[PDB]
Amino acid sequence: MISLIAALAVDRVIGMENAMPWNLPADFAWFKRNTLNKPVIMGRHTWESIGRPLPGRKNIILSSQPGTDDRVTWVKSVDEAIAACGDVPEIMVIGGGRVYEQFLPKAQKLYLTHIDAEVEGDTHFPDYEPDDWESVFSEFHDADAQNSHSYCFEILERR
Numbered sequence: 001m002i003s004l005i006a007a008l009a010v011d012r013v014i015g016m017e018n019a020m021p022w023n024l025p026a027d028f029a030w031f032k033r034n035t036l037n038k039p040v041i042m043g044r045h046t047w048e049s050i051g052r053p054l055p056g057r058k059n060i061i062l063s064s065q066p067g068t069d070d071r072v073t074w075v076k077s078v079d080e081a082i083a084a085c086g087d088v089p090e091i092m093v094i095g096g097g098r099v100y101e102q103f104l105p106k107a108q109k110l111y112l113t114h115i116d117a118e119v120e121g122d123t124h125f126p127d128y129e130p131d132d133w134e135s136v137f138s139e140f141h142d143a144d145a146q147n148s149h150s151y152c153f154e155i156l157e158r159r
């Protein structure tokens with residue numbers, strides 16, 4: 001099963017100049033808990049933004065060109081990316097915008113963090129069809145001393 005995990009600010013903004021333009025440690029804990037011990041697929045720009053493999057996860061990088069780092073597994077197509085994960089219960093697609101768009105039609109689950117932040121961005125999550133998805137988990141949190149925005153963790157399953 002293929003899942004997408006993403007954090008979305010107002011208007012589905014996910015990124016600006018190769019970063020996530022907000023401060024939300026609660027989302028790091030959610031991301032780690034839901035990706036650890038699962039393979040993660042990401043695009044080259046997202047890979048370049050992290051600089052080092054995510055520990056405890058098989059890191060698969062999509063790029064049309066030959067790989068440049070043997071600490072991760074490089075693939076040249078969506079189907080090769082999926083194949084490189086082998087037979088696992090759940091594959092996690094972790095971004096960015098262009099990768100999310102291509103995996104959305106193949107995904108059965110979305111893990112979304114909806115962040116109440118107004119941010120300018122140059123990257124947005126795809127415009128998913130709400131009727132195709134059932135919300136199976138939704139937990140809202142107010143801002144606190146560590147998290148400067150309110151946020152809501154949501155899991156949606158494809159109907």
Ligand SMILES: NC(=O)C1=CN([C@@H]2O[C@H](COP(=O)(O)OP(=O)(O)OC[C@H]3O[C@@H](n4cnc5c(N)ncnc54)[C@H](OP(=O)(O)O)[C@@H]3O)[C@@H](O)[C@H]2O)C=CC1
Nearest residue numbers: 006007015018019043044045046063064095096097098099
């Ligand atoms: N808010 C969030 O949850 C997250 C946000 N982000 C943000 O997303 C942004 C990056 O997204 P974006 O610019 O769209 O880039 P991506 O991270 O999606 O990487 C795009 C690159 O991946 C490669 N690629 C993608 N699809 C394929 C394919 N089918 N075959 C071969 N190679 C492929 C290409 O590399 P090549 O050019 O080498 O061919 C392409 O240029 C950043 O701002 C980042 O901070 C990232 C992850 C999470």
Ligand SMILES: [Ca+2]
Nearest residue numbers: 116117149150
């Ligand atoms: Ca806010």
